[PDB]
Amino acid sequence: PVPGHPIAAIATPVGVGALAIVRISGAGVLDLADRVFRKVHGSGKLAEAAGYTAHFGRLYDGEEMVDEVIALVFRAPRSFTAEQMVEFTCHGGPVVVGRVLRLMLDNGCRLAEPGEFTRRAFLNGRIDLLQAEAIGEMIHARTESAYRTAVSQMKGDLSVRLGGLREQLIRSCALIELELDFSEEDVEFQSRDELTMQIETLRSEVNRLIDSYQHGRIVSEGVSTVIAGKPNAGKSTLLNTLLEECFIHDKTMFRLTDMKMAEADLILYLLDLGTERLDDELTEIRELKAAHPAAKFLTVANKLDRAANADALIRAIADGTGTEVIGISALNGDGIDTLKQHMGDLVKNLDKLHEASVLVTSLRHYEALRNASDALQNALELIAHESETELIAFELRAALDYVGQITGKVVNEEVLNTIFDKFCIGK
Amino acid sequence: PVPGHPIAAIATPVGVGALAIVRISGAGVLDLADRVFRKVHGSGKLAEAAGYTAHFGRLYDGEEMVDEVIALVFRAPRSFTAEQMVEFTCHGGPVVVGRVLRLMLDNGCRLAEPGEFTRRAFLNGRIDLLQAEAIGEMIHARTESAYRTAVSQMKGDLSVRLGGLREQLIRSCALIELELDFSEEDVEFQSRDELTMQIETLRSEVNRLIDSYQHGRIVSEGVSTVIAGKPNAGKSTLLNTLLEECFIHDKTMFRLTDMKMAEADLILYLLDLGTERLDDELTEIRELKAAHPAAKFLTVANKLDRAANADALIRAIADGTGTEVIGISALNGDGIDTLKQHMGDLVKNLDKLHEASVLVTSLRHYEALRNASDALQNALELIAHESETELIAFELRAALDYVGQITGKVVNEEVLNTIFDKFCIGK
Ligand SMILES: Nc1nc(=O)c2c([nH]1)NC[C@@H](CNc1ccc(C(=O)N[C@@H](CCC(=O)O)C(=O)O)cc1)N2C=O
Ligand SMILES: Nc1nc(=O)c2c([nH]1)NC[C@@H](CNc1ccc(C(=O)N[C@@H](CCC(=O)O)C(=O)O)cc1)N2C=O
Ligand SMILES: Nc1nc2c(ncn2[C@@H]2O[C@H](COP(=O)(O)OP(=O)(O)O)[C@@H](O)[C@H]2O)c(=O)[nH]1
Numbered sequence: 015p016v017p018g019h020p021i022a023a024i025a026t027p028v029g030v031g032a033l034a035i036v037r038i039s040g041a042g043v044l045d046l047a048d049r050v051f052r053k054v055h056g057s058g059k060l061a062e063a064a065g066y067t068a069h070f071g072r073l074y075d076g077e078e079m080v081d082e083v084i085a086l087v088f089r090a091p092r093s094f095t096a097e098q099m100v101e102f103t104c105h106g107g108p109v110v111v112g113r114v115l116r117l118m119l120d121n122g123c124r125l126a127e128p129g130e131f132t133r134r135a136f137l138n139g140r141i142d143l144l145q146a147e148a149i150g151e152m153i154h155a156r157t158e159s160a161y162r163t164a165v166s167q168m169k170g171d172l173s174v175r176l177g178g179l180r181e182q183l184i185r186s187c188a189l190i191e192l193e194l195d196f197s198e199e200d201v202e203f204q205s206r207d208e209l210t211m212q213i214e215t216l217r218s219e220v221n222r223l224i225d226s227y228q229h230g231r232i233v234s235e236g237v238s239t240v241i242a243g244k245p246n247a248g249k250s251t252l253l254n255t256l257l258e259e260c261f262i263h264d265k266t267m268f269r270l271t272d273m274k275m276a277e278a279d280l281i282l283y284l285l286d287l288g289t290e291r292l293d294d295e296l297t298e299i300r301e302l303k304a305a306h307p308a309a310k311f312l313t314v315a316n317k318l319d320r321a322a323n324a325d326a327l328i329r330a331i332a333d334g335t336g337t338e339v340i341g342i343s344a345l346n347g348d349g350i351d352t353l354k355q356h357m358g359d360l361v362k363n364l365d366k367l368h369e370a371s372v373l374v375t376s377l378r379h380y381e382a383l384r385n386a387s388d389a390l391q392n393a394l395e396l397i398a399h400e401s402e403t404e405l406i407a408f409e410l411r412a413a414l415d416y417v418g419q420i421t422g423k424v425v426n427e428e429v430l431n432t433i434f435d436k437f438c439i440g441k
Numbered sequence: 442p443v444p445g446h447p448i449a450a451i452a453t454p455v456g457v458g459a460l461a462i463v464r465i466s467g468a469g470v471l472d473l474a475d476r477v478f479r480k481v482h483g484s485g486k487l488a489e490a491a492g493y494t495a496h497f498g499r500l501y502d503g504e505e506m507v508d509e510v511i512a513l514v515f516r517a518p519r520s521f522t523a524e525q526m527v528e529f530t531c532h533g534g535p536v537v538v539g540r541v542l543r544l545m546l547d548n549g550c551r552l553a554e555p556g557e558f559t560r561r562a563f564l565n566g567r568i569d570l571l572q573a574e575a576i577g578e579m580i581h582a583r584t585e586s587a588y589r590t591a592v593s594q595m596k597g598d599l600s601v602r603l604g605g606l607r608e609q610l611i612r613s614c615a616l617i618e619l620e621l622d623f624s625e626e627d628v629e630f631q632s633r634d635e636l637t638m639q640i641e642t643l644r645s646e647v648n649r650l651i652d653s654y655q656h657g658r659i660v661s662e663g664v665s666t667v668i669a670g671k672p673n674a675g676k677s678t679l680l681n682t683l684l685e686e687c688f689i690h691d692k693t694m695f696r697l698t699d700m701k702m703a704e705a706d707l708i709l710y711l712l713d714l715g716t717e718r719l720d721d722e723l724t725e726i727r728e729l730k731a732a733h734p735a736a737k738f739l740t741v742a743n744k745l746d747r748a749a750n751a752d753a754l755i756r757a758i759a760d761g762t763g764t765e766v767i768g769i770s771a772l773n774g775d776g777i778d779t780l781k782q783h784m785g786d787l788v789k790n791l792d793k794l795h796e797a798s799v800l801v802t803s804l805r806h807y808e809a810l811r812n813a814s815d816a817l818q819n820a821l822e823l824i825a826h827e828s829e830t831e832l833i834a835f836e837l838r839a840a841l842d843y844v845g846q847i848t849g850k851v852v853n854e855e856v857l858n859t860i861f862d863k864f865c866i867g868k
């Protein structure tokens with residue numbers, strides 16, 4: 015259970031508050047703490063204290079009282095990082111808290127890399143990659159549904175389901191992984207008949223998951239929306255009135271941005287109604303819609319506040335493009351309520367299984383679940399007819415390898431880096 | 442030791458972090474905690490737990506897992522508020538932390554008024570008014586010297602010294618407070634000779650303190666500086682290049698502002714060098730200096746970047762006003778280093794006793810120490826010659842009343858309000 019280098023970090027948000035937490039972790043941490051911590055009543059040393067036990071004392075830079083704090087000892091595996099840690103919670107002043115962090119840093123600790131604490135929690139096996147990512151997802155969450163999704167993932171709901179898939183991928187895999195030497199007349203009395211039934215129910219279980227990512231990505235990172243249109247359309251004017259940037263409506267988040275339009279849930283084409291000289295740029299809107307059939311298209315006719323006649327003009331833009339058109343005054347803010355309601359339509363019209371089925375989020379998992387079900391189909395369709403008995407065991411191990419990668423069974427230490435660099439120093 | 446209404450509050454700074462602390466306190470708080478907290482391994486209830494003991498469990502809104510937290514039980518008088526409190530430290534996401542606070546609020550707690558926690562700590566007598574104010578002073582501190590000053594006051598250094606004054610004000614006061622009935626031929630063999638010596642050493646001890654406020658106010662709330670001059674002088678241009686607003690230089694803070702000039706440590710008069718048509722507004726600068734003799738005056742000749750000749754002009758502004766003049770280009774930033782150095786001169790030239798003498802800060806204390814030494818002089822000079830023996834006991838009780846007010850011996854519950862309204866919700 016090797017401990018890491020002692021590391022320290024401010025664990026609470028930057029700013030002014032009643033209290034802050036400096037948290038240190040790693041090899042010999044509470045011996046280090048003892049050099050600077052001094053118990054106020056009696057001298058019960060921290061290194062002598064039980065886990066989950068709090069101590070009121072003072073921090074010192076040699077006769078220089080840094081602050082009055084409360085030290086929380088954690089021991090053994092029974093901590094967040096699953097190593098030795100103490101957590102000073104001090105007065106929540108920026109100058110004070112910074113002094114505390116420095117004191118730790120001067121007396122043995124190094125500054126924590128971003129997400130290193132959770133990284134250690136995963137590496138020590140207290141928590142898995144899903145759960146690790148879930149911690150991050152919760153802290154950054156800005157929607158209720160995003161928050162609730164991370165709670166589920168932290169609780170491990172997905173991990174349970176994925177563990178229930180590793181089940182057959184241990185069962186049916188090791189069943190053929192023992193063809194190594196004992197292959198003379200190996201059977202289980204019509205055994206391959208049940209193996210196909212194991213895979214068919216196994217692959218369909220993976221498919222139920224790969225499906226939820228459509229809803230999941232929306233809940234996690236919101237409905238990605240592009241605002242298109244030629245210069246002077248009103249793009250800027252709409253953007254800041256609706257609030258790279260995002261806003262919330264009907265418990266759903268919308269990521270507004272410009273430029274990769276491949277992968278974009280909703281396209282809003284802005285064109286200045288009755289103002290456009292060259293109005294056959296509705297040919298342009300016809301070929302945006304055509305180039306992104308997966309997206310939801312929505313034609314936003316701007317500058318409705320002038321020319322009070324444009325009902326026929328709206329219908330002409332509609333008919334000429336086959337898209338849906340909405341009249342908008344981005345300056346005044348007219349019909350915006352109607353535009354917003356049309357935007358909230360995207361989530362409403364999708365699918366969504368019985369709420370028991372947990373939503374998979376994050377591209378990484380999706381792609382792996384795909385890679386798994388492809389290897390599963392390779393065993394199902396490509397191999398299961400007349401093909402060999404050694405190449406089939408390759409595909410099954412490939413699937414178990416893929417399902418396991420999402421939970422961290424196979425550590426990539428670059429998959430980890432992209433995950434934890436996303437975290438902030440302190441977690 | 443009457444407990445207050447259970448109150449809850451986010452105790453950590455607003456924002457995004459690894460961890461946050463919701464802290465609740467008051468009557469029956471850990472019974473309330475128990476309705477929502479659920480220990481993860483075993484069911485050791487919080488209300489059954491020892492003080493200074495931490496518990497890892499989950500918060501719930503009835504089958505709805507709010508978060509995975511760690512509860513810290515505090516009991517009896519042995520807590521910050523000196524009442525029953527638990528402190529949940531949860532994942533530091535704004536959505537999460539807010540959910541936690543709501544859970545507390547829905548299950549018995551009310552939202553804490555600002556500074557109520559420290560208010561309770563003072564009211565329960567765990568801590569005094571000085572120490573109470575010191576907590577605030579530390580959290581808001583933005584200078585090292587401001588930080589170190591609050592630490593001293595939190596440690597109680599001033600309180601010790603002031604307690605050492607309450608000494609004689611109990612000794613010499615009750616010595617004459619027993620003239621109530623036992624006055625027939627009361628003596629202590631030439632007793633009044635030592636009483637004057639008690640007061641003379643007592644009043645001079647108060648005077649040592651009233652003196653430190655000159656340095657103290659600077660350390661606490663910084664050198665208050667007014668930037669004066671007629672429109673188009675360059676006031677705005679200087680202000681934002683030097684950074685209502687304040688900046689730091691030579692470990693000292695400068696409060697820049699416009700208008701009450703009564704009470705202002707440093708006045709900078711800006712006038713556009715070589716640019717001023719009506720240059721006999723140096724009559725105006727002569728009568729600012731004359732109207733505020735206590736302040737430090739400093740004539741700042743702006744717009745030096747044009748007219749490369751103004752050495753003679755500088756000297757003319759100098760000679761015509763008897764002030765010190767500095768050439769400044771507020772736009773380019775020339776001679777600003779020289780202006781800053783002249784500003785740092787104010788703190789350097791003052792007094793400062795041997796560093797053992799603690800700095801009194803805060804107008805409130807100052808005025809009270811004055812009120813005390815005035816009552817002390819009333820006993821010393823007004824009374825001690827031929828005056829009565831009943832009116833002398835009035836002045837001595839007045840001094841003890843004044844010295845005691847600064848430490849909270851006499852609670853004003855409006856003195857308290859102005860102090861704690863200054864605090865933020867959570868402390
Ligand atoms: N003071 C504090 N420190 C933390 O590290 C922390 C909080 N609070 N609040 C939220 C909590 C959530 N995460 C956890 C998870 C597990 C453990 C832990 O000590 N693990 C033991 C539990 C066994 C037990 O005591 O019942 C384990 O062996 O799993 C600590 C924090 N968390 C971090 O965000
Ligand atoms: N978790 C936490 N809670 C707090 O309330 C708190 C921190 N940390 N860190 C800084 C500390 C400073 N203030 C104090 C002061 C006294 C006590 C206290 O429990 N008083 C007992 C001490 C006796 C003992 O255990 O030795 C007393 O009777 O005076 C708690 C916090 N503080 C708040 O800002
Ligand atoms: N009358 C009117 N003018 C608008 C409206 N929206 C934008 N404009 C004007 O059109 C100009 C360009 O708009 P802008 O949002 O910057 O479009 P963009 O440059 O393509 O992002 C601005 O100077 C606005 O004054 C609108 O709804 N009504």
Ligand SMILES: Nc1nc2c(ncn2[C@@H]2O[C@H](COP(=O)(O)OP(=O)(O)O)[C@@H](O)[C@H]2O)c(=O)[nH]1
Binds near residue numbers: 677678747
């Ligand atoms: N060349 C030059 N122009 C300046 C300087 N300082 C200010 N100005 C100009 O003087 C004008 C008024 O300055 P301002 O700071 O607003 O003075 P205030 O209105 O009295 O606060 C501005 O428009 C500046 O362009 C300087 O140091 N050099």
